[PDB]
Every structure is written in structure tokens, then in C-alpha cells.
Ligand binder design. Sequence first.
Ligand code: HEM
Ligand SMILES: CC1(C)[C@@H]2CC[C@@]1(C)C(=O)C2
Ligand SMILES: [K+]
Length: 404
Amino acid sequence: LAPLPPHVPEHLVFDFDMYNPSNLSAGVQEAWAVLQESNVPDLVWTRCNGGHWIATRGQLIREAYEDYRHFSSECPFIPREAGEAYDFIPTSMDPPEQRQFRALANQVVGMPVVDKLENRIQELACSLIESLRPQGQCNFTEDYAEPFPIRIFMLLAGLPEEDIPHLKYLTDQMTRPDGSMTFAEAKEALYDYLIPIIEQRRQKPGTDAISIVANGQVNGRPITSDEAKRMCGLLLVGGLDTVVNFLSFSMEFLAKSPEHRQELIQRPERIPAACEELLRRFSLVADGRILTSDYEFHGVQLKKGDQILLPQMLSGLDERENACPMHVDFSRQKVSHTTFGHGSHLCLGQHLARREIIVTLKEWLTRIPDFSIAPGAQIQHKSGIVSGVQALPLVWDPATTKAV
Ligand code: HEM
Ligand SMILES: CC1(C)[C@@H]2CC[C@@]1(C)C(=O)C2
Ligand SMILES: [K+]
């Protein structure tokens, strides 16, 4: 706990730690939602992790993401030193400067590219699930959640699969540090990895994501080596953590809820709607912004330089945005959320993610309609910039499955 800053009133102190929340054993989403209780003010101050504002409601979260003149992306991570070292592109930039880099990035991970990758994404999901099918059991996190999205990203990026363990290790230290590496050391190690690759692909431009970024133009002039490295590193981090953990939360839930599996098996055309309601319920990111000057927000005085966590996971969990928010309803009429961010940095890989999510639900349920959490298992979650599942042992009777 860091010393309470002069300007912060004692009645807003809410000592939540984002890398280690108190009710974590009840589920990471439920751990974060303690912040939405009756007693908790809309905007609170935790002294954990150096000290920072935490907006707890969707209304505040959306307005701050919208207000980039006051809440800047220049230092978007907690703790402060991680935010200061953070220089990925385009996420550490604000409009207007941000915009040109974001268009290039959009060219490598957007909808047209999801369409190109459609066949491989389908093939790999079916392949991995067919492989697990006859066993009647799997360690979901290691056997599908990780390899499915990661191998598609390594494919798009034109990087060898043998590099996965190094790169996933560095990405996880940036989002759920175990103490071994600082954010800055992790980032520098990912940049170290990309340097030569960028240089090779500048000499011999190819079709992969690194070549396209490295030889790209940002509103008409050539991107530099440095800029390409800072965009590439963001891309790997984005491709190696979020979908990976998200699939685990979603399969854990389906494993615990036979009626929801029955609904998608009966009506597969509902999978896209279900994917969105799951994104709401099992939202997992929380990053933030830095105050560009003193500013009064929802009656609380913020000081220039104050950091504020704007938990994207919190907006669709807010009872004020959705009725019975902890309830999963695939027919939910207006599924409101900020899972893919909000404002000018809206996730560019959101189309790639929804395709991986919908393919996984449809192809798993097609071959392995019925499955459960391994007997006696207690699922453990983990919290941080991206929250996740430590492990997910699933079981099923092979006699109930089908090869397709
Ligand atoms: C369920 C999966 C995903 C979730 C929940 C998610 C969430 C987010 C969020 C909340 C942001 C904004 C952060 C901020 O405002 O500081 C973001 C940005 C971004 N995401 Fe995703 N993401 C997912 C998947 C992906 C994938 C698969 C990629 C592909 C590499 C990716 C690439 C990006 C990029 C490049 C940005 C930066 C946009 C900018 O800064 O303008 N994301 N994502
Ligand atoms: C918060 C995020 C998911 C978003 C893309 C990857 C990520 C960890 C960032 O650094 C920006
Ligand atoms: K920074």
C-alpha cells in the first residue's frame, strides 16, 4: 500500500489489487465485481500497486475512454513504471497521431485478413478437437486454448512454432507478471526477438504480418524500423493472451452448464449471439489511462499525472448496463459491453477473436457435445491486465462424441 496522495479523500479509498483481488477464489470476474457493490463509490482509490483511480461503473469507464484530451493512452498500464515503459503502437498514442498507425495495423489483423484465414482457422480447430475427442479428457488450457489462437497468430506472422514457449512466456509477464521479469524487461526481450526479423523482411518483403507492418506506410511515408518493432510487439501480445484466456473462461462455463450446451447444440445459428453474451459475462481486460492535467470527474478531483484504471471487464458486468449481469442469457436483448475496449483504441483484432470463438464453440460442440469439469477439480483464475484461467481439466465419455 502506497501513501495516500494529498488530494485523495479518505472516503474513496478502496484498496483493490488488480493482480491479486480479494474474492479471487470465487472467480476473477466475481473478484472484480466486488467493486460494484452497494457501498462502493463510483470512483475509488486503491493504494495498491503504487496508487491509482479505479472507475467502477460502465458510464464512467466509457466517458473516460472517449475523453482522450484528458485521459491519455501515453501511460496505459499499472504499475506506473510499466505504463512509462509501455511504448507499443498504436496503443500508447492518442489521436490524432494514433490514427495513421492504427490503419496499418488494421490492414494486418482486420476483417479482410480474417476472411483470408477462414480456412486455416476452421481446419486447425477441427484438427485439434478431433485429436482430443477419443481421449475423453484434456487439459483445455494447454491442449486447445493456447495452441489454437497461438498457432494461427504464428502462421499469420510467419514465425516458427518452436518460438511459442519463449514468446508466450514474455507476453504473460507483461499481463500477469509472476515477479521474474519487470514489464520493461519483458518488452525489451520481445523487441530483441523482433529486430532481425524486421530487418530481414525489410530486405525481402513477404506476405506475413511482420513484412506487411515492416514495409508499410503511415499516411504515405515509410514506417521506420523502430515504429515497426513497436507495432509488431503489440500485435504478438494481442495475439497470444486475450483469445487464449477467453476461450478457457467460456469452456469452463459451458462445462458447468448443460442447459447452455443444449441450447447451442439445438440452435447453432445462435452461436454468434452466445459468443457476444459470453464476451460480456467473461470479459477479461483492464488497462487504463493517465491524466493530462488537473480535471474534475464525476465530482472527484483528479491531478495531472494521476493514473486511472478503466476496467473494460466492468462495463458489461454493471447491473446498470444489463439486468442480472452475472447471469448468462444467450437471448439477452441488448448485450452491452466494452469488452473490446471503447473509443479510438477499439480492439482491431476483435473480428479475428469472434471468428476463433464462434468456430471453437461450433466445432467443439459438433464433436464433443457433452463434457464436464474433471471430478474434484477446483478451477483457479488469475488476475492482471488480462485475467485468465490457470488450468481447465475437462472430461467426457467418448461414446457420446462423433468424428465429423
Ligand atoms: C477476446 C479477445 C480480445 C479482447 C477482449 C481484446 C481487447 C482489447 C482491448 C480492451 C483493447 C483496447 C485497450 C486500450 O484501450 O488500451 C484492445 C486493443 C487492441 N487489440 Fe485486442 N482484444 C482481443 C483480441 C485481440 C487479437 C486476437 C488481436 C490481434 C493481434 C488484438 C489486437 C489489438 C490491437 C492491435 C489493439 C490496439 C488498438 C489501438 O491501440 O488502437 N486483440 N483489444
Ligand atoms: C490491453 C490489451 C489487450 C490491448 C492489446 C493487447 C493489450 C495487453 C495491450 O497492451 C493493448
Ligand atoms: K509510455
